[PDB]
């Protein structure tokens, strides 16, 4: 149905399970319950969210399951193969970002150049 909503800003991967409303969902990473009751503040679960802080590409990347409490993980609609290289403030330059940066750069440059040209022409 509704796919997962992966949100990565820096060293924090926030998985979101939009399906299964009105129930306590649980996560599972490679047949291992994560985000539950474990003495680890890096992995957290709250309101169908999975916050993995300080994400690792080696040990914290694989298949992630989201299933309501009392149901078997093999009854989920689909799985999620998460493979992502995270950073401390590594940005993502997509098409719209470079487009808007280029257009604002050229507009600012043209405006400033025209202003200086008109000022130097009118000063004499």
């Amino acid at each position: 149905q509704t796919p997962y909503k992966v949100s990565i800003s820096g060293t924090t991967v926030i998985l979101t399970c939009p399906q299964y409303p009105g129930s306590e969902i649980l996560w599972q990473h490679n047949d291992k319950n994560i985000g539950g009751d474990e003495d680890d503040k890096n992995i957290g679960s709250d309101e169908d969210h999975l916050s993995l802080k300080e994400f690792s590409e080696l040990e914290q990347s694989g298949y992630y399951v989201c299933y309501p409490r009392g149901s078997k993980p093999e009854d989920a609609n689909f799985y999620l193969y998460l493979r992502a290289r995270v950073c401390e403030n590594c940005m993502e330059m997509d098409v719209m970002s470079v487009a808007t940066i280029v257009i604002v750069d050229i507009c600012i440059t043209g405006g400033l150049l025209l202003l200086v040209y008109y000022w130097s022409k009118n000063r004499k």
Epitope: G22, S23, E24, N33, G36, D37, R69, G70, K72, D75
Partner: antibody, heavy 119, light 107 residues
């Protein structure tokens, strides 16, 4: 392994407030949840609701909503169920049970408390 | 809200026969657990995951099933099987029990 202790016979009035308890010991209480079951004399079992001892996630159904409130305590690793606005059909037996995730069932129960209400 | 209906409500048979119990579900569930409760005591886990046995239950208890209807067979009755059995599933959102079957020993 898991043994759950429940109170005895508790006396109340129609419309009063009762607060029964389930006493857990012998295991990691914060890792397993607790479900509450109601059994009236002459009928089967009906699930009331459950609570997660980790953060306090509560879940009930439409029949027991606005009627029962579940709390949990870690200083004694116990559970409490508070009822209010009682009537005749509230007099029943209440059990508490531990849920096993790897077994998908209620493995251990309690002896239950007999609630008698009358005018 | 998958209502669990147990059709064989009242069962009476002689010790040593093969008696079975059916629990029908309104929707297809993933599993089914069976709890046993005698008169004047608390229920207990009898069969979980629809194929496994608890600790202390004799080996003649054998139930299985799939889809929307599940069965529980008795490979020989003794003087202990006189109790009430409840089918339960939490595959859907809420926890649900069964109507309950009263199994008594004939003579």
């Amino acid at each position: 392994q898991v043994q759950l202790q429940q109170s005895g016979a508790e006396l109340a009035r129609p419309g009063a407030s009762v607060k029964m308890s389930c006493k857990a010991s012998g295991y990691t209480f914060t890792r397993y949840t607790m479900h509450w079951v109601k059994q009236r004399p002459g009928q089967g079992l009906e699930w009331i609701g459950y609570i997660n001892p980790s953060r306090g996630y509560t879940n009930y159904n439409q029949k027991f909503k606005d009627k029962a409130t579940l709390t949990t305590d870690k200083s004694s690793s116990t559970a409490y169920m508070q009822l209010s606005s009682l009537t005749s059909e509230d007099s029943a037996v209440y059990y508490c049970a531990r849920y096993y995730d790897d077994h998908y069932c209620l493995d251990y129960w309690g002896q239950g408390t007999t609630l008698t209400v009358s005018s | 809200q998958i209502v669990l209906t147990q059709s064989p409500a009242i069962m009476s048979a002689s010790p040593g026969e093969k008696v079975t119990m059916t629990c029908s579900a309104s929707s297809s569930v993933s599993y089914m657990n069976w709890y046993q409760q005698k008169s004047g005591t608390s229920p207990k886990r009898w069969i979980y995951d629809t194929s496994k046995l608890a600790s202390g239950v004799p080996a003649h208890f054998r139930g299985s099933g799939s889809g929307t209807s599940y069965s529980l067979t008795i490979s020989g009755m003794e003087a202990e099987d006189a109790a009430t059995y409840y089918c339960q599933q939490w595959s859907s959102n809420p926890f649900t029990f069964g109507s309950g079957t009263k199994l008594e020993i004939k003579r």
